[PDB]
Design a protein around this ligand. Sequence first.
Ligand SMILES: [O-]S(O)(O)c1ccc(-c2c3nc(c(-c4ccc(S([O-])(O)O)cc4)c4ccc([nH]4)c(-c4ccc(S([O-])(O)O)cc4)c4nc(c(-c5ccc(S([O-])(O)O)cc5)c5ccc2[nH]5)C=C4)C=C3)cc1
Ligand SMILES: [O-]S(O)(O)c1ccc(-c2c3nc(c(-c4ccc(S([O-])(O)O)cc4)c4ccc([nH]4)c(-c4ccc(S([O-])(O)O)cc4)c4nc(c(-c5ccc(S([O-])(O)O)cc5)c5ccc2[nH]5)C=C4)C=C3)cc1
Ligand SMILES: [O-]S(O)(O)c1ccc(-c2c3nc(c(-c4ccc(S([O-])(O)O)cc4)c4ccc([nH]4)c(-c4ccc(S([O-])(O)O)cc4)c4nc(c(-c5ccc(S([O-])(O)O)cc5)c5ccc2[nH]5)C=C4)C=C3)cc1
Ligand SMILES: [O-]S(O)(O)c1ccc(-c2c3nc(c(-c4ccc(S([O-])(O)O)cc4)c4ccc([nH]4)c(-c4ccc(S([O-])(O)O)cc4)c4nc(c(-c5ccc(S([O-])(O)O)cc5)c5ccc2[nH]5)C=C4)C=C3)cc1
Ligand SMILES: [O-]S(O)(O)c1ccc(-c2c3nc(c(-c4ccc(S([O-])(O)O)cc4)c4ccc([nH]4)c(-c4ccc(S([O-])(O)O)cc4)c4nc(c(-c5ccc(S([O-])(O)O)cc5)c5ccc2[nH]5)C=C4)C=C3)cc1
Ligand SMILES: [O-]S(O)(O)c1ccc(-c2c3nc(c(-c4ccc(S([O-])(O)O)cc4)c4ccc([nH]4)c(-c4ccc(S([O-])(O)O)cc4)c4nc(c(-c5ccc(S([O-])(O)O)cc5)c5ccc2[nH]5)C=C4)C=C3)cc1
Ligand SMILES: [O-]S(O)(O)c1ccc(-c2c3nc(c(-c4ccc(S([O-])(O)O)cc4)c4ccc([nH]4)c(-c4ccc(S([O-])(O)O)cc4)c4nc(c(-c5ccc(S([O-])(O)O)cc5)c5ccc2[nH]5)C=C4)C=C3)cc1
Ligand SMILES: [O-]S(O)(O)c1ccc(-c2c3nc(c(-c4ccc(S([O-])(O)O)cc4)c4ccc([nH]4)c(-c4ccc(S([O-])(O)O)cc4)c4nc(c(-c5ccc(S([O-])(O)O)cc5)c5ccc2[nH]5)C=C4)C=C3)cc1
Ligand SMILES: [O-]S(O)(O)c1ccc(-c2c3nc(c(-c4ccc(S([O-])(O)O)cc4)c4ccc([nH]4)c(-c4ccc(S([O-])(O)O)cc4)c4nc(c(-c5ccc(S([O-])(O)O)cc5)c5ccc2[nH]5)C=C4)C=C3)cc1
Ligand SMILES: [Ca+2]
Ligand SMILES: [Ca+2]
Ligand SMILES: [Ca+2]
Ligand SMILES: [Ca+2]
Ligand SMILES: [Mn+2]
Ligand SMILES: [Mn+2]
Ligand SMILES: [Mn+2]
Ligand SMILES: [Mn+2]
Lengths: 232, 232, 232, 232
Amino acid sequence: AETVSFNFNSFSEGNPAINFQGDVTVLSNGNIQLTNLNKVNSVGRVLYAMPVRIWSSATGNVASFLTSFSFEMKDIKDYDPADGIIFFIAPEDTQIPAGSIGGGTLGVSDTKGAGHFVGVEFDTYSNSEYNDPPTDHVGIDVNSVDSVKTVPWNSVSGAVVKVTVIYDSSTKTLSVAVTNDNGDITTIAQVVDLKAKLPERVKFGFSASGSLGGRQIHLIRSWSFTSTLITT
Amino acid sequence: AETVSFNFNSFSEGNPAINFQGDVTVLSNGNIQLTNLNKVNSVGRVLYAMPVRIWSSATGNVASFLTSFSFEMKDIKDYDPADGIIFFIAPEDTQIPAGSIGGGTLGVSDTKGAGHFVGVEFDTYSNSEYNDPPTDHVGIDVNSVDSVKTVPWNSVSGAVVKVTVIYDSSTKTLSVAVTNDNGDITTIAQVVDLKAKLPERVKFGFSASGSLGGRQIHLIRSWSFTSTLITT
Amino acid sequence: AETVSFNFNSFSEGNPAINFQGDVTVLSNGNIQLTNLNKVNSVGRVLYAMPVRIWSSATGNVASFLTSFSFEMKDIKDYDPADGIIFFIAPEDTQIPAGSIGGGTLGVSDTKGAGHFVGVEFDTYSNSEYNDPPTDHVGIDVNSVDSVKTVPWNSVSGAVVKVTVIYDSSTKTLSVAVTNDNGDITTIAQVVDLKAKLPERVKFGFSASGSLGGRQIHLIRSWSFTSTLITT
Amino acid sequence: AETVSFNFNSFSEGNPAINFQGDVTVLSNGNIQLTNLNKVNSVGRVLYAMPVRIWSSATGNVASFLTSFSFEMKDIKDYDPADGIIFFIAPEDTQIPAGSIGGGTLGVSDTKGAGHFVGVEFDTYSNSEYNDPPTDHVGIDVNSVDSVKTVPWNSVSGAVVKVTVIYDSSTKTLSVAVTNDNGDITTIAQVVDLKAKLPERVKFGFSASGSLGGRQIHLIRSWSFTSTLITT
Ligand SMILES: [O-]S(O)(O)c1ccc(-c2c3nc(c(-c4ccc(S([O-])(O)O)cc4)c4ccc([nH]4)c(-c4ccc(S([O-])(O)O)cc4)c4nc(c(-c5ccc(S([O-])(O)O)cc5)c5ccc2[nH]5)C=C4)C=C3)cc1
Ligand SMILES: [O-]S(O)(O)c1ccc(-c2c3nc(c(-c4ccc(S([O-])(O)O)cc4)c4ccc([nH]4)c(-c4ccc(S([O-])(O)O)cc4)c4nc(c(-c5ccc(S([O-])(O)O)cc5)c5ccc2[nH]5)C=C4)C=C3)cc1
Ligand SMILES: [O-]S(O)(O)c1ccc(-c2c3nc(c(-c4ccc(S([O-])(O)O)cc4)c4ccc([nH]4)c(-c4ccc(S([O-])(O)O)cc4)c4nc(c(-c5ccc(S([O-])(O)O)cc5)c5ccc2[nH]5)C=C4)C=C3)cc1
Ligand SMILES: [O-]S(O)(O)c1ccc(-c2c3nc(c(-c4ccc(S([O-])(O)O)cc4)c4ccc([nH]4)c(-c4ccc(S([O-])(O)O)cc4)c4nc(c(-c5ccc(S([O-])(O)O)cc5)c5ccc2[nH]5)C=C4)C=C3)cc1
Ligand SMILES: [O-]S(O)(O)c1ccc(-c2c3nc(c(-c4ccc(S([O-])(O)O)cc4)c4ccc([nH]4)c(-c4ccc(S([O-])(O)O)cc4)c4nc(c(-c5ccc(S([O-])(O)O)cc5)c5ccc2[nH]5)C=C4)C=C3)cc1
Ligand SMILES: [O-]S(O)(O)c1ccc(-c2c3nc(c(-c4ccc(S([O-])(O)O)cc4)c4ccc([nH]4)c(-c4ccc(S([O-])(O)O)cc4)c4nc(c(-c5ccc(S([O-])(O)O)cc5)c5ccc2[nH]5)C=C4)C=C3)cc1
Ligand SMILES: [O-]S(O)(O)c1ccc(-c2c3nc(c(-c4ccc(S([O-])(O)O)cc4)c4ccc([nH]4)c(-c4ccc(S([O-])(O)O)cc4)c4nc(c(-c5ccc(S([O-])(O)O)cc5)c5ccc2[nH]5)C=C4)C=C3)cc1
Ligand SMILES: [O-]S(O)(O)c1ccc(-c2c3nc(c(-c4ccc(S([O-])(O)O)cc4)c4ccc([nH]4)c(-c4ccc(S([O-])(O)O)cc4)c4nc(c(-c5ccc(S([O-])(O)O)cc5)c5ccc2[nH]5)C=C4)C=C3)cc1
Ligand SMILES: [O-]S(O)(O)c1ccc(-c2c3nc(c(-c4ccc(S([O-])(O)O)cc4)c4ccc([nH]4)c(-c4ccc(S([O-])(O)O)cc4)c4nc(c(-c5ccc(S([O-])(O)O)cc5)c5ccc2[nH]5)C=C4)C=C3)cc1
Ligand SMILES: [Ca+2]
Ligand SMILES: [Ca+2]
Ligand SMILES: [Ca+2]
Ligand SMILES: [Ca+2]
Ligand SMILES: [Mn+2]
Ligand SMILES: [Mn+2]
Ligand SMILES: [Mn+2]
Ligand SMILES: [Mn+2]
């Protein structure tokens, strides 16, 4: 079968395996910082350089993937914790959205909240403008920052989070599982025909954003991904 | 929230956290061997000692869980590789099924293939008697060794397999992801109202079985489980 | 550490992980055929799409890699068996050399035999023009098809060959091991400062070529590569 | 040519192809356990029964060999992980060294650390007594447990390791490549005139050792070897 599999326990600029779009800054400790704290409307994304072919117009098949990653969002004195991180899939040609300001497009949509991508969001700030549930949540976005489905979650400053994602090729089920510091697990799941929303070749990555009054650190500590596309 | 979480990177008899039913033998290397190679109809199960309350007749809620484990099945000269391992959930009072012989009840059902449990099987031998697909497969059993759903898989002797399982409380979606030695991933998913098939208190574990002509080693190398039941 | 690792047990056009330059044709059986039999001066290469950073101008370090692959070269009635296959490393910008004719540039050099690359060759036809030893050989090329070192080898039509390559980061030692059909092993080794001949970002692949009178099938059946670059 | 080639994916006592010296115990799962956990100064070796003639006093030639193997070292509650495994070559008459105690002779040398053999070690415990680098390492021993060369490595409990070794007949270059669980590869290489340190007929095998305070399980899961001696 056709399989893609990489693994990052640390990061460093110059690695041809990763493309940095935006205010992404790599720390001297192999950690990725997605947003710039001294900017209004900061926006940053990190992408796996090579396009992965998720489905075949020939086979009709759609790949399954098992990806897990860890992150951390520490608060900063006199600032609203926002906007949150986001793990997403987009067309190989994906450009980084327009930086916006009070806004919270998580770096994947326009001022309105539209965009061509599919992703899991770890949102920590409500925006009446995009239907943001009253509090912190994990969502499943499909071409819109107005999550298709959402589940109550709670973000804890300085806490390392572990996230395991599974996608079933057949059942077209995207299933997330958020492991918190204390132990408790948060989970959400949703059907998303990857073959219906995304072109054959897409790209995987993490994106973030901030506002004029909303800022915080967004750290991607590690990432491991594996996808297999049956073809025969 | 109410959360259960344990982790085994090795095993050893005498640990009050685990109950051994059957031909289960713990190796001098912290590995669990489920079946006896010198017996006809061997049968062995390993269970997590404490019952876990998966759902509340009060809350109406159902717990989500994230469990991952690793195993190995090595062949033995002049023998049919069978019957395979099985990760399952049963009523807290679960007794070990009647050993059977040519059979392949995987240690959780009667000669007919019936039984009260829900599990994911890693079957390596077809039995016209239970609708076993032509070849090796991973299935989703619900009170029957005649899998509700199955997906083509391939068992490799002496290979360590990693398995990550996720259950969503709401969507009632059981999602498995099998990682093979070469890298490729196999995934299957199914809806199973845990609150519909199982009593409030159940038990988690791994079971196995062998036949007169079918035998092999069944090793459970490691296991980590975590469930969280929202109650409020 | 920074590690790259992929694995191909079969191939298929359209996979974004591989670039096809030349007369490369993918068979309906997941096998790569490097040259066109009905052409004079056929030339074909297959490359791993992403550039791998072999050394760091910052760390001063150079990655080690373990790559193994298998191939087959079947003869064709009324034709001289040539030119042979070649596993090579080149600057990320590598274009496919000019097709040549009686020649045997193995698809990586000019008419003269010069070129910017480093590779292991599995040559099956002698050319007084490039110092080709009297018979079939395995060589170690460094910017020239006139091998730096060579060892007697014997190519057998329709035989599948297994090749394991190891490169030591420190000792700068490139070590090959050719396993033939009958069992016997052929081995060659050579020091090559990868950091001295190649730019930071290079590409890995297999190349081939044919002549007016020299032609044969060149099949790359499988390929597995892994490189690790220590950085800290 | 003169070629030796065997392959073990499992083991079992009684096989005339293998000699067991020491506390070697074969598990009911085709796995070899090198040391006894309940002994002070345990020592165990496993050898390929037949002597292999590495070089000819006639030809002047030296054989090349390609051997790869896999092992596992799991820790045990309240014990220092030691001493490690070792793949070695010795004179056909090789007796198993004197068991020692606090010591870490890896079962191939005297209390002083001397001995007649050549091997690659996978050491997991430092001994000021033999120049052991601060931490876990892979070394190249030549008649002394005080490695000629060493490279930083990291041993992970319960992890299966794959090791590919290549020896070039001419360049007299012994090249190792350690593949860890996460993917990363560790490599080391050294020149060792086999014809200079060893007699014509030698034996290949794996050895281990433990101490009063240092103990752990040492498992040899598989082994495949092939050597070819050119003679003409
Ligand atoms: O514009 S301003 O003037 O306003 C201005 C704005 C911001 C900054 C800060 C800053 N760090 C702070 C804390 C902090 C402060 C106060 C409290 S408080 O007391 O509670 O208030 C709490 C926490 C803080 C805590 C821990 C760290 N910073 C660690 C760190 C963590 C973990 C490890 S580890 O590995 O050991 O785990 C190692 C290191 C690092 N910090 C850097 C780093 C850097 C250097 C070079 C390079 S580069 O050149 O690129 O290589 C890249 C990155 C910078 C550059 C600027 C900078 N840090 C690298 C590691 C607070 C402010 C300075 C001035
Ligand atoms: O404009 S203003 O004047 O308003 C203004 C706005 C923002 C800032 C701050 C700031 N950090 C703070 C904390 C903080 C302090 C006290 C508490 S409190 O005690 O709770 O109150 C809570 C939080 C804080 C805590 C931890 C960190 N900061 C860490 C850090 C990361 C990762 C790790 S670790 O261990 O995970 O690796 C460890 C530590 C980093 N911070 C940077 C960094 C940076 C430097 C250079 C570059 S570059 O361009 O690349 O050179 C890019 C990025 C900046 C730039 C500005 C900045 N940090 C890099 C790492 C508080 C304020 C200062 C002034
Ligand atoms: O499109 S978006 O919607 O995304 C969007 C994008 C960008 C912006 C902002 C912005 N500034 C903000 C503050 C701000 C306000 C309130 C708070 S808060 O209230 O605390 O929250 C915090 C921060 C803010 C505070 C101070 C300044 N801005 C100062 C400044 C600094 C120093 C001095 S000085 O001299 O006194 O030192 C004087 C003035 C300047 N700002 C510019 C400037 C500019 C002008 C002309 C030209 S040009 O045409 O080239 O000439 C080039 C550049 C722009 C252009 C855009 C822009 N500033 C020039 C000086 C907040 C947002 C808004 C929306
Ligand atoms: O309006 S008022 O304000 O007056 C008002 C009065 C009462 C309530 C409470 C309440 N339960 C409390 C405890 C409690 C918590 C902490 C302490 S503490 O010790 O002080 O801290 C002490 C006591 C508490 C503890 C255990 C239970 N409740 C269990 C239970 C028993 C057994 C098991 S098990 O697993 O063992 O079998 C599992 C769960 C149940 N509770 C219900 C239940 C119910 C739901 C739906 C249906 S139906 O519609 O039919 O579906 C039928 C019944 C209700 C409905 C209302 C209600 N419980 C069903 C099971 C405390 C308050 C709220 C508001
Ligand atoms: O009139 S007002 O508007 O003012 C008003 C009056 C009453 C209420 C409360 C209330 N519960 C409280 C506690 C509480 C919290 C902290 C402490 S403290 O720690 O002491 O502070 C003490 C007590 C509390 C603790 C535990 C429970 N409640 C549990 C419960 C039991 C068992 C389990 S489990 O899982 O363990 O089995 C899990 C959960 C349940 N509670 C319900 C339940 C219910 C839901 C649906 C249906 S229906 O759909 O109709 O069937 C029927 C019944 C209601 C409905 C109203 C209501 N509970 C069902 C289960 C405190 C207030 C709110 C507003
Ligand atoms: O100009 S002339 O008239 O002179 C002239 C010159 C050359 C040819 C031959 C030829 N093949 C021969 C053997 C052969 C015969 C007898 C013996 S004998 O026994 O020694 O006698 C030995 C060898 C031979 C053996 C095996 C193959 N050919 C295999 C093949 C490879 C690998 C596998 S497998 O399974 O291992 O992968 C399976 C099959 C293939 N051959 C093609 C192929 C092709 C087609 C379309 C496209 S495209 O257009 O791109 O679609 C691309 C490529 C062509 C095109 C021309 C051509 N093959 C594709 C696969 C002998 C002659 C004919 C006439
Ligand atoms: O009508 S019929 O059906 O009867 C019929 C009549 C003639 C032909 C042939 C033909 N070439 C042959 C060999 C050949 C094969 C085997 C042997 S054998 O050894 O004897 O067996 C001997 C010879 C042969 C060998 C090498 C070449 N041909 C090379 C060549 C050399 C070197 C290089 S290089 O650069 O790589 O060095 C690259 C390419 C070229 N051939 C042309 C070319 C051409 C293209 C465009 C234009 S134009 O219109 O002006 O644009 C003008 C000319 C034509 C046009 C027709 C034609 N070639 C251009 C380059 C054998 C027959 C086919 C059918
Ligand atoms: O199966 S068959 O029946 O077919 C059959 C097959 C092969 C043989 C031969 C053979 N040697 C020949 C010449 C030869 C003869 C005549 C002329 S002519 O007159 O010129 O024509 C030319 C050449 C020949 C010349 C020189 C040597 N042989 C030298 C030698 C080289 C270099 C030096 S030195 O000092 O210079 O280094 C010293 C000695 C040696 N030969 C051996 C040796 C051996 C012994 C023990 C062990 S072991 O068991 O491992 O201990 C391993 C190997 C064997 C084993 C078989 C064998 N030699 C060891 C050294 C001709 C045939 C006989 C029968
Ligand atoms: O059965 S068959 O009939 O088929 C048959 C086939 C082949 C043979 C021959 C043979 N050697 C010949 C000459 C020769 C003689 C005269 C002229 S002429 O007079 O010019 O015509 C031309 C050529 C010849 C000349 C020199 C040598 N042989 C030298 C040699 C090289 C270098 C030096 S040195 O030290 O000086 O450098 C010293 C000696 C050696 N030969 C061996 C050797 C061997 C031994 C053990 C081992 S092993 O198993 O590994 O131990 C491996 C190899 C064998 C085994 C068979 C064999 N040699 C080792 C060294 C002619 C025939 C006999 C029968
Ligand atoms: Ca938001
Ligand atoms: Ca079965
Ligand atoms: Ca040539
Ligand atoms: Ca030691
Ligand atoms: Mn949202
Ligand atoms: Mn079945
Ligand atoms: Mn050559
Ligand atoms: Mn040592």
